[PDB]
Amino acid sequence: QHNPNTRDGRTAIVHLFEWRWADIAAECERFLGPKGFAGVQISPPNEHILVSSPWRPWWQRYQPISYNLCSRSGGENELRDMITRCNNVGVNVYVDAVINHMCGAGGGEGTHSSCGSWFNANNKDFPSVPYSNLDFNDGKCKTGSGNIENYGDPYQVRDCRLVGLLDLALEKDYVRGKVADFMNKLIDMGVAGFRVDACKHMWPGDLDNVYRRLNNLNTKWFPGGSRPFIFQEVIDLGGEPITTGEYVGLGRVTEFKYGARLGELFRKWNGQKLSYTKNWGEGWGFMADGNAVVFTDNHDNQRGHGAGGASILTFWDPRLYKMAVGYMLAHPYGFTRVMSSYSWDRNFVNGKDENDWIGPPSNGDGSTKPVPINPDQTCGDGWVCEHRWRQIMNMVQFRNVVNGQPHANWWDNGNNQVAFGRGNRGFIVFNNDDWALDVTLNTGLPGGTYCDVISGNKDGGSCTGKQITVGGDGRAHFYINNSEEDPFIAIHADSKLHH
Numbered sequence: 001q002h003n004p005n006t007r008d009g010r011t012a013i014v015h016l017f018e019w020r021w022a023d024i025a026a027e028c029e030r031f032l033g034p035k036g037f038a039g040v041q042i043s044p045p046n047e048h049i050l051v052s053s054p055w056r057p058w059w060q061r062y063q064p065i066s067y068n069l070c071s072r073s074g075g076e077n078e079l080r081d082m083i084t085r086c087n088n089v090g091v092n093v094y095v096d097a098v099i100n101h102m103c104g105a106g107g108g109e110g111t112h113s114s115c116g117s118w119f120n121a122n123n124k125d126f127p128s129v130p131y132s133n134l135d136f137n138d139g140k141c142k143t144g145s146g147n148i149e150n151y152g153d154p155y156q157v158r159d160c161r162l163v164g165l166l167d168l169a170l171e172k173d174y175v176r177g178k179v180a181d182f183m184n185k186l187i188d189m190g191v192a193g194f195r196v197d198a199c200k201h202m203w204p205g206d207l208d209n210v211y212r213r214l215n216n217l218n219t220k221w222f223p224g225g226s227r228p229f230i231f232q233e234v235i236d237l238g239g240e241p242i243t244t245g246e247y248v249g250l251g252r253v254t255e256f257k258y259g260a261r262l263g264e265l266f267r268k269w270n271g272q273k274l275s276y277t278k279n280w281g282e283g284w285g286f287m288a289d290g291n292a293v294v295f296t297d298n299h300d301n302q303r304g305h306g307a308g309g310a311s312i313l314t315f316w317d318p319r320l321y322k323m324a325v326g327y328m329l330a331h332p333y334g335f336t337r338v339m340s341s342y343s344w345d346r347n348f349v350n351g352k353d354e355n356d357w358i359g360p361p362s363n364g365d366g367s368t369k370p371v372p373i374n375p376d377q378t379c380g381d382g383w384v385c386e387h388r389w390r391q392i393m394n395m396v397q398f399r400n401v402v403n404g405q406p407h408a409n410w411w412d413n414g415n416n417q418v419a420f421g422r423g424n425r426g427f428i429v430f431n432n433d434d435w436a437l438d439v440t441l442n443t444g445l446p447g448g449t450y451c452d453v454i455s456g457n458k459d460g461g462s463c464t465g466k467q468i469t470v471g472g473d474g475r476a477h478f479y480i481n482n483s484e485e486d487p488f489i490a491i492h493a494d495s496k497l498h499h
């Protein structure tokens with residue numbers, strides 16, 4: 001279950017946070033397949049509440065109502081059509097699985113649900129599953145409020161309510177059964193794996209019992225004996241009584257130290273310097289490489305009040321962001337996931353974004369808009385589409401090209417200019433200092449003229465952007481002025497030219 005099940009040598013996945021199924025499938029066919037992406041993570045596809053105050057926030061999709069497959073992104077039929085079209089062009093589908101809980105205790109009752117089901121969160125009644133009062137952890141929690149009040153306490157964190165969300169009693173064979181039927185339903189459709197939401201809050205005991213109930217993947221696209229990929233949301237930045245160690249044997253875990261630490265590096269906070277990152281990865285106390293899923297930001301912390309808070313980097317800070325994501329994609333550590341966000345009117349009041357609840361671009365009526373493609377291959381309507389940025393999609397290719405090659409040929413100027421290679425397949429160079437980068441380096445690469453994929457690509461027998469001359473000895477001179485709008489350069493075997 002640590003195996004991502006990627007095909008065709010592809011190596012990375014995007015979180016198309018909040019996209020409609022119909023949009024994802026189109027994007028699969030037109031872009032993801034062609035451009036070498038290994039797969040998509042999609043927002044929770046189950047039925048969920050519709051919050052009205054505030055108006056239809058992104059976070060409503062993390063308050064399930066039933067396991068019926070109709071959500072903000074689409075219906076069961078759209079869903080199946082997407083998996084299929086994405087699969088047919090080799091892009092896997094990973095599902096965000098919300099199973100720690102149902103909706104909030106004060107969810108009230110009525111038919112305000114993504115399917116228009118009826119339900120009564122006051123009596124803990126969810127007829128569509130069905131679930132009922134006895135399927136919840138109330139008796140097990142001993143907090144005054146019945147919410148998690150202290151994270152120093154490992155029992156609270158599993159058995160109490162996460163900020164008020166009704167905590168499923170996952171020791172119960174009935175509940176374990178229900179959840180698995182859900183995940184199996186998805187797997188049967190051709191889903192490749194899961195991002196299990198909220199894992200810090202469930203017992204590894206209960207998790208294993210579920211994971212063991214899951215079928216092998218659909219042999220329509222996946223070899224026999226393939227298992228669902230599992231990666232788990234656990235936040236651990238040190239000092240936590242709860243560590244990723246407890247989950248790491250059940251499947252992969254999110255390494256939140258990765259983005260947090262990487263952010264303060266390119267920001268240069270607390271006298272952290274890029275040069276320090278030669279032993280980046282396990283060296284830095286990150287978990288074991290084969291257990292890790294790594295990313296710069298996710299939907300939570302890109303709103304500045306999650307793991308890493310202020311130090312996390314987002315499309316809001318393009319220049320640093322591109323370098324950070326490029327670094328991540330070049331480095332061998334972890335299994336990498338690129339963010340794909342939408343924007344919204346940020347409103348900071350005492351350093352908190354009072355608008356961080358805002359959902360995706362959408363028609364009033366709270367249904368989400370499609371994703372329009374601009375002719376120069378970017379996205380309209382408030383969809384950001386970082387995954388479509390030249391400096392990103394090209395590093396996604398870079399990672400495919402160099403896949404497997406060792407970290408090699410490290411260099412640094414003692415400060416915030418560094419470079420490294422991956423085998424003899426690729427070399428990357430960063431300049432995050434306040435003066436120019438100016439050196440000859442052993443790239444470890446075959447001699448020739450390579451195209452800098454950051455500033456463009458190889459097209460025909462020429463470079464659309466910068467280009468770089470590697471001597472037969474593999475030495476190459478780099479000049480990156482700190483003025484440069486993208487102060488880093490990358491080249492690789494597939495960006496080389498004929499003799």
Ligand SMILES: [Ca+2]
Binds near residue numbers: 157158159160
């Ligand atoms: Ca729980």
Ligand SMILES: [Cl-]
Binds near residue numbers: 233254298
């Ligand atoms: Cl995550």
